[PDB]
């Protein structure tokens, strides 16, 4: 609240300093931001404690950055951490005390939890609460009565209005409890699903699962994990532990296919007990319990097919023990978020790898599903070898003179097709691919602009893939890339970042970018994170290039596009010039060649 | 360096400067490797010796060390060819110099210097001294232009600010000596005192200024005896740098925070720590004032917390690379005053003028293909005079 002569807020008169400050490696700002030391001998103990109560926002190598909020604190109580259980240790760990504002905030957040509990039974949602006083003063707003369908006091609530009420209670200072007591539940018989000994659970995976299962009752929340970290395995394990009906929801045809393979590979459950509620193909969804479906079909808004209609009615009627939603970052979408209310589930676990977006709808994920249970440390995984180390880089490609003139001259937005297609980046990518091609490194180019992607591919006569590409040709190209030594590069369009199972690649060039989308960058980055059989963290075998054009709008997006990655700890190095580019022969080595491309670019319209 | 200072002096002042007590000794330590040895050898000799002997007294290998040493001392004029006997005054004085004839202080020096820097920056609370302010103003690192308003800080002031204390102080005293002559203070008398430290009206005023900079402290109500501080004769780092342009400095002295704020945005200030971010806005702001990326990297490097000393390089490459790039963008458009030519009837005259400009150095850039060149306004008169002369 107090501002120094500079921008920083003043806290000299706010909180004191512990005499043994050096022993205590923890800081506590009044705003809730916390700065831990990654060099302290007791760093690990602090890391576990802070992660339990706070959600990371920046975890560079030396000094991590944690901020706590109401959602973060509620999760701590769910795992059994009381206000004194956390504040006492926080004061002990704090090297500068705890400001009263945080103290009262912690007290208010912890006490305002568990008073209101939401339980669904017999397809009816009852807002149970041991304390009756909470309900008495909770019915002041008229929305509650109209929302409601027309000790331990409970009342049934309308199915459709659950989401509206859930967000209302969050700002009402009375969060709802979504814990599932699968251990004590006889209404829905347990499913015959078991985890085979073959599956191996990594220490972070166990910790993420442990945080989800704070007590005998499973907690509904979001577990963010890298795609190469094996987030699919964790989802399977959670379903196996619940031992009740689970409805995994994908986002595309590829997503549903992989999940079924993951279930069979890691779960002993029989093949016949798994169904694919997919329009393209089905396996008698009503017949068995464990099902894999997609947001589009379940949330499909237009006319429903007769066969789908029966399945949809069957899904609505039944009650699901678990509702795994992979790629939760798309949930707050209008159609996608409707699926939450359409189906009934006790705890709706959420998995993903890039929990970031521009529109401030990510915060809704806290109430749409639950608090962010776990968010693995990408840097720590790199040290442990679970994830391939990446030498993130940003190759600056100076714009050719003529190209800039039209780019600056025109105030229209043809520039997206212009600065994405310039000779220097073309030579840069052409040179960059050539260097990696002779190094036996697998390349995965990317480009939002299909027009640029096709032009780059034909000139480099490489197997470019994109949306309307035939499925058969899509598989044929991938198989050659994985197997054929003669080919070690595939030019994938945006479809690559959506969902796929691609072979591990040593490098990932990105000539163009869709825009300032932290999702796409992290989505595309996860492709090379696939750990190799016998690599090492320090070898930096995996690389990532995000080619950009200097003095162009592309730079603004690139800096705005790397915010999420740097927060994890990745350092994006800049490369003004590439050694050996001049000696190596490359296309567009003469003014005429650039002129024809510019004319074609201008003729694009 | 001190060698540069003594090098630019006349023979007349040099021997006078070679006072008996110390100067013959202080200038001796300066002698890097070999001149020391040669000085002692010809210290008891009253007979000059031929120049050939000195040349052949160093083996063929490392012969360069001989030439640089002889050239260095010839400027110092310790000997004369006399045809290489040493100066009798220096010989006598040196022979007289060779068998012939605390914890609180450093804190005071640390504190006194710190307050001076506080005044140097726009610190509302600082020590007031009219003599000190004007001295810095005429030192070339400050300009007021308005006695009523406190003086501001020039471009050179910021560069001086980010320098390390030894280089910062040494340069500061260097200007004092140059300005001492301008104000009329004898250079020799004041200079000799500095050497005597490492072992009149002007002296009292000179000592008063030294006492003001924190180098000395009488401690006895300005008595004749003085106890020089450590800085008179001539530490762990604290800043922690992340990979996301975030600085965590364990600074309690407001000076360090003020220095960091010059090229970064401050976010939080804890009792024993402060959080700052190195964003484009701050760095270019510092570059605009006059700083260059080298000082910031050096300043961050020198004040490097021990935690990041283990990693090599100490400063992460991205932070260093980003800082260098930000300054480069500022000077993408290099402005240089000049005068253009047009309508060259013949290239021979243009070539002849080009040769004339090259000889005089007036030319700044030339274009043979377009038959044109650019000349600075200073050389514009010279070429214009040449054109008139035909």
């Amino acid at each position: 609240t107090k501002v120094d002569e500079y921008g920083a807020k003043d806290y000299r008169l706010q909180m004191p300093l512990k005499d043994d400050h050096t022993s205590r490696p923890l800081w506590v700002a009044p705003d809730g931001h916390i700065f831990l030391e990654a060099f302290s001998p007791v760093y690990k103990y602090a890391q576990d404690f802070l992660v339990a109560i706070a959600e990371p926002v920046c975890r560079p190598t030396h000094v991590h950055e944690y901020k706590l909020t109401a959602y973060s604190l509620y999760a701590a109580v769910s795992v059994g951490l009381q206000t004194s259980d956390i504040t006492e240790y926080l004061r002990k760990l704090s090297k500068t005390g705890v400001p009263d504002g945080i103290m009262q905030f912690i007290k208010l957040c912890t006490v305002s939890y568990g008073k209101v509990k939401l339980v669904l039974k017999h397809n009816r949602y009852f807002v149970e609460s041991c304390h009756p006083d909470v309900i008495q003063h909770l019915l002041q707003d008229p929305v509650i009565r109209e929302c409601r369908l027309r000790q331990t006091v409970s009342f049934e609530v309308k199915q459709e209005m659950i989401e509206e009420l859930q967000k209302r209670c969050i700002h009402l200072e009375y969060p709802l409890l979504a814990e599932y007591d699968f251990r004590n539940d006889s209404v829905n018989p347990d499913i015959n699903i078991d985890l085979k000994p073959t599956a191996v659970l990594r220490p972070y995976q166990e910790k993420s699962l442990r945080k989800m299962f704070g007590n005998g009752r499973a907690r509904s929340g979001v577990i963010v994990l890298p795609c190469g970290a094996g987030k699919s395995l964790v989802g399977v394990t959670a379903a196996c532990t619940v031992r009740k009906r689970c409805l995994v929801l994908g986002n595309s045809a590829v997503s549903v296919e992989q999940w079924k393979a993951q279930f069979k590979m890691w779960s002993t459950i029989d093949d016949s007990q798994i169904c694919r509620f997919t329009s393209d193909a089905k396996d008698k969804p009503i017949g068995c319990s464990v099902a894999i479906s997609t947001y589009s079909m379940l949330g499909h808004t237009t006319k429903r097919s007769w066969e789908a209609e029966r399945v949809m009615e069957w899904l609505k009627t039944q009650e699901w023990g678990l509702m795994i939603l992979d790629e939760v970052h798309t949930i707050p979408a209008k159609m996608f978020r409707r699926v939450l209310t359409i189906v009934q589930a006790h705890c709706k676990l959420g998995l993903t790898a890039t929990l970031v977006r521009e529109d401030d709808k990510i915060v809704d994920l806290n109430f749409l599903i639950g608090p962010k249970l776990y968010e693995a440390n990408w840097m720590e995984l790199q040290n442990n070898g679970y994830i391939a180390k990446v030498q993130c880089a940003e190759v600056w490609c100076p714009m050719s003179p003529e190209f800039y003139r039209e780019y600056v001259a025109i105030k229209t937005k043809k520039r997206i097709l212009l600065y994405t297609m310039n000779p220097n980046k073309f030579r840069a990518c052409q040179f960059l691919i050539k260097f990696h091609e002779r190094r036996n490194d697998k390349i995965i180019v990317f480009a939002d602009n299909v027009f640029a992607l096709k032009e780059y591919a034909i000139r480099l006569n490489k197997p470019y893939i994109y949306g309307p590409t035939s499925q058969g040709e899509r598989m044929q190209i991938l198989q050659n890339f994985k197997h054929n030594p003669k080919i070690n590069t595939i030019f994938i369009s945006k479809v690559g970042d959506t969902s796929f199972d691609l072979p591990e690649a040593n490098v990932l060039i990105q000539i163009s970018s869709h825009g300032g989308s932290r999702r796409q960058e992290a989505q595309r980055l996860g492709r090379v994170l696939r750990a190799k059989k016998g690599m090492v963290a320090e070898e930096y075998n995996a690389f990532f290039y995000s080619l950009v054009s200097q003095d162009t709008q592309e730079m603004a997006y690139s800096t705005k596009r790397q915010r999420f990655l740097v927060d994890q700890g990745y350092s994006f190095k800049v490369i003004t010039k590439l050694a050996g580019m001049e000696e190596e022969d490359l296309a567009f080595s003469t003014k005429e060649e650039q002129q024809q491309l510019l004319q074609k670019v201008l003729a694009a319209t | 360096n001190l060698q540069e200072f003594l090098g630019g002096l006349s023979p007349g002042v040099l021997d006078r400067l070679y006072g008996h007590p110390a100067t013959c000794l202080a200038v001796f330590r300066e002698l890097p490797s070999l001149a020391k040895n040669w000085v002692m050898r010809m210290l008891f000799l009253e007979q000059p010796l031929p120049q050939a002997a000195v040349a052949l007294w160093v083996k063929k290998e490392f012969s360069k060390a001989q030439e640089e040493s002889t050239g260095l001392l010839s400027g110092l004029r310790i000997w004369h060819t006399q045809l290489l006997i040493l100066n009798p005054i220096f010989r006598q004085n040196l022979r007289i110099a060779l068998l012939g004839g605390v914890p609180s202080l450093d804190k005071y020096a640390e504190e006194r210097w710190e307050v001076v820097l506080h005044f140097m920056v726009g610190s509302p609370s600082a020590a007031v001294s009219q003599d000190l302010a004007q001295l810095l103003s005429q030192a070339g690192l400050m300009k007021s232009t308005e006695p009523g308003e406190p003086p501001c800080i020039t471009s050179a002031g910021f560069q001086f600010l980010l320098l390390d204390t030894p280089a910062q102080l040494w340069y500061f005293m260097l200007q004092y000596l140059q300005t001492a002559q301008s104000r009329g203070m004898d250079l020799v008398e004041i200079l000799s005192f500095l050497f005597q430290l490492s072992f009149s009206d002007s002296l009292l005023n000179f000592l008063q200024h030294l006492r003001e900079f924190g180098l000395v402290f009488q401690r006895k109500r300005k008595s004749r005896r003085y106890y020089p501080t450590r800085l008179a004769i001539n530490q762990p780092g604290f800043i922690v740098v992340e990979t996301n342009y975030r600085l965590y400095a364990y600074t309690e002295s407001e000076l360090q925070i003020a220095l960091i704020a010059l090229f970064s945005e401050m976010l939080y200030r804890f009792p024993n720590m402060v959080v700052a971010q190195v964003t484009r806005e701050s760095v270019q702001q510092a570059i605009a004032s006059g700083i260059t990326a080298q000082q910031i990297i050096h300043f961050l490097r020198t004040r490097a917390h021990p935690v990041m000393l283990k990693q090599t390089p100490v400063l992460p490459p991205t932070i260093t690379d980003q800082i260098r790039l930000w300054e480069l963008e500022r000077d993408r458009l290099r402005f240089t005053e000049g005068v253009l030519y047009n309508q060259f009837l013949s290239q021979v005259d243009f070539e002849l003028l080009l040769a004339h400009a090259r000889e005089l150095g007036v030319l700044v850039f030339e274009n043979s293909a377009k038959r044109l060149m650019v000349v600075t306004p200073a050389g514009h008169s010279d070429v214009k005079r040449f054109w008139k002369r035909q």
């Binding site: 260097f435 930096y540 003004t576 | 490459p317 260098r324 790039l325 480069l328």
Partner: peptide
């Protein structure tokens, strides 16, 4: 063998 490229090993900025 399998050594990192020059433009990644050291800064390519003119400084």
């Amino acid at each position: 063998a399998k050594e990192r490229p020059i433009w990644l090993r050291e800064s390519t900025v003119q400084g």
